[PDB]
Amino acid sequence: ASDFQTGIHKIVIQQSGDTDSFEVSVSIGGADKGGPAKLYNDKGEYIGDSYSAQIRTATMSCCTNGNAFFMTCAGSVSSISEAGKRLHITVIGYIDDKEVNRLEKEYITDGNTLIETFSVSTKEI
Amino acid sequence: DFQTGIHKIVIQQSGDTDSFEVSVSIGGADKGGPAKLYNDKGEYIGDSYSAQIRTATMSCCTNGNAFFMTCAGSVSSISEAGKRLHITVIGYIDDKEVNRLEKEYITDGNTLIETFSVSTKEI
Numbered sequence: 001a002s003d004f005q006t007g008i009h010k011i012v013i014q015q016s017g018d019t020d021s022f023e024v025s026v027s028i029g030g031a032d033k034g035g036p037a038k039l040y041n042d043k044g045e046y047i048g049d050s051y052s053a054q055i056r057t058a059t060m061s062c063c064t065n066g067n068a069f070f071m072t073c074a075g076s077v078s079s080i081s082e083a084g085k086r087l088h089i090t091v092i093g094y095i096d097d098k099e100v101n102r103l104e105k106e107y108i109t110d111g112n113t114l115i116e117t118f119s120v121s122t123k124e125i
Numbered sequence: 126d127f128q129t130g131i132h133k134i135v136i137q138q139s140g141d142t143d144s145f146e147v148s149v150s151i152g153g154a155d156k157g158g159p160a161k162l163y164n165d166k167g168e169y170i171g172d173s174y175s176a177q178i179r180t181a182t183m184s185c186c187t188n189g190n191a192f193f194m195t196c197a198g199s200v201s202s203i204s205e206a207g208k209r210l211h212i213t214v215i216g217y218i219d220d221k222e223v224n225r226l227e228k229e230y231i232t233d234g235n236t237l238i239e240t241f242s243v244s245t246k247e248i
Contacts, residue, residue: 001238025159027152029175031199031240036148036175050173052152052159070240072197076154078127113127115192117246 003124007096009037009071010063011120014090015055021085021109023078024055028062030071030122037068072121083111093122101125127156130219132194132245133186137213138178144208145230145237146201147178151185153194153245160187160194189219195244206234216245 009030015022028051030037036049042061051062064071073091086108093101103120132153151174153160159172165184174185187194194216202208209231216224226243 001236004238023154023156023158025152025154027150027159027173027195029148029150029173029197031148031201033146033201033203035146035177036150048173050150050152050171050175052173054158069201069238070199072150072240072242074152074195074197074242074244076193078154078156078192080127080156115127115246117193117195117244119195119197119242119244121197121240123240 004069005095006067006069008063008066009068009122010061010094011071011073012059012061012092013055014059015087017087018085019087021079021081022087024075024089025052026055026073026075027052028073030064030068032067032069037064037071039064070121070123072119074119075117077107077116079109079114081109083109085109091120093120095122127192128247129155129190129192131186131189132191133184133217134194134196134243134245135182135184135215136178137182138210139181140210141208142210144202144204145210148175148199149178150175150197153187153191155190155192160191162187193246195242198241200230200239202232202237204232206232208232214241214243216243218245
């Protein structure tokens with residue numbers, strides 16, 4: 001329980017590289033003491049208590065209300081492109097604007113089918 | 126072409142279920158983006174799903190074009206000591222078991238908060 005903090009949990013995702021050569025999808029959720037966490041987009045609009053999206057812009061973010069104690073982002077990155085295409089993915093997890101975890105990924109296609117996955121959360125590792 | 130199939134996650138809980146709050150978030154992927162999700166009856170439930178689990182079992186699956194599924198769970202309790210929860214999570218691709226998680230949670234008087242994660246993918 002000490003690994004969890006109640007507050008506004010947030011995930012920010014940024015991508016760079018040969019973005020048209022890769023499909024990047026994420027699923028985001030969290031929890032509060034009563035159920036799945038309510039989720040909000042970068043403008044603060046309510047988007048439900050589950051969320052998935054293909055990443056098609058440079059930056060996306062998702063946050064909770066202030067009752068959440070946990071938030072997770074699971075993603076997949078795939079490509080059937082020719083060898084030598086490159087993607088960078090950064091996923092940052094915050095609680096009340098403090099960075100609590102970060103994933104940095106670099107992908108480069110080798111001519112075979114590329115399928116990779118990742119996960120990050122706001123739990124203390 | 127990607128190696129695809131029906132990805133499926135099954136969750137089973139038991140014990141002092143009224144003493145625990147169990148939340149799950151489920152999603153998957155195919156070459157188009159997030160995978161459509163279906164319940165145990167084959168009904169479309171969205172391309173994202175979350176629930177407070179209040180039954181003994183639940184399942185979620187994709188159609189045959191998925192290459193990834195994942196389930197993130199939270200278990201919490203503010204109950205007295207000695208309440209017990211068993212969780213089994215099983216992941217399949219084309220009904221072949223590819224992953225599993227088994228957990229037993231027992232309260233000790235303090236606030237209990239634990240999380241879990243189970244994914245399905247080809248290796």
